[PDB]
């Protein structure tokens, strides 16, 4: 890897500088270099990795949706034939997006998940695995679509099982996992009732545990709880 000659601490330092500069591709490359040093990641480092790749794939996903919408409009009755260019360029963006997802999944498989023994790290990485299979599912149209969807589901489910056993219902990792798995149910698995049930149950159990928290933990948990409520308002 191109980062093999740089010190782990320098890669982490540069990832933080890249974030400040809004250079998310650089941030992700630095964090990939740090993961490939082979040591486990601290909580802060896990969040740098997640933030970096989410910004990268978020730009790709937004671009893919724009291009997919144009492509669908071109395939309506009455639309003039404009050639292969829209499909080709949508495919180019799609292939780049899939490559980033495969890169993240590769880091998780080699070897972040297998070395993650604490609940907070293991749930974090399994949520990430579910997220990046979910992004693959958003663009999948072929023979492997069902297996991609089931890979996301299986990763989310293992993360859910650990989080319910080992974390309080207000834990922000647990809350964000539930938020994302609920969205998976709603828009990937065609299970809006499961999505709504999960979001409501997660919100209500967190509400009942807020009394145990400091002011700063309360702020963290209620922020994600508001996102669950926002989705429930959209869906009902």
């Amino acid at each position: 890897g191109a980062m093999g000659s740089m010190e782990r601490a320098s890669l982490i330092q540069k990832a933080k500088l890249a974030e400040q500069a809004e250079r998310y591709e650089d941030m992700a490359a630095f964090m990939k270099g740090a993961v490939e040093k082979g040591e486990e990641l601290s909580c802060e480092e896990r969040n740098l990795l997640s933030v970096a790749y989410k910004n990268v794939v978020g730009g790709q996903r937004a671009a893919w949706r724009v291009l997919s919408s144009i492509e669908q409009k071109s395939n309506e009755e009455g639309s003039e034939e404009k050639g292969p260019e829209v499909r080709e360029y949508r495919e180019k963006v799609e292939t780049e997006l899939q490559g980033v997802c495969d890169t993240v999944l590769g880091l998780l498989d080699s070897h972040l998940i297998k070395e993650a023994g604490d609940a907070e790290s293991r749930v974090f990485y399994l949520k990430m695995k579910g997220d990046y299979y979910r992004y693959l599912a958003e663009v999948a149209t072929g023979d492997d679509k069902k297996r991609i969807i089931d890979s996301a589901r299986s990763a989310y489910q293992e993360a859910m099982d650990i989080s319910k056993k080992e974390m309080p219902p207000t834990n922000p990792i647990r809350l964000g996992l539930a938020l994302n798995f609920s969205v998976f149910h709603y828009e990937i698995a065609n299970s809006p009732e499961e999505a709504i049930s999960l979001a409501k149950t997660t919100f209500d159990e967190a509400m009942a545990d807020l009394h145990t928290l400091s002011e700063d933990s309360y702020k963290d948990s209620t922020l994600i709880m508001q996102l669950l409520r926002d989705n429930l308002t959209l869906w009902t």
Partner: peptide
């Protein structure tokens, strides 16, 4: 308003 998902733990 697009539905919400998160990448971070906190």
């Amino acid at each position: 308003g697009r539905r919400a998902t998160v990448p971070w733990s906190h």
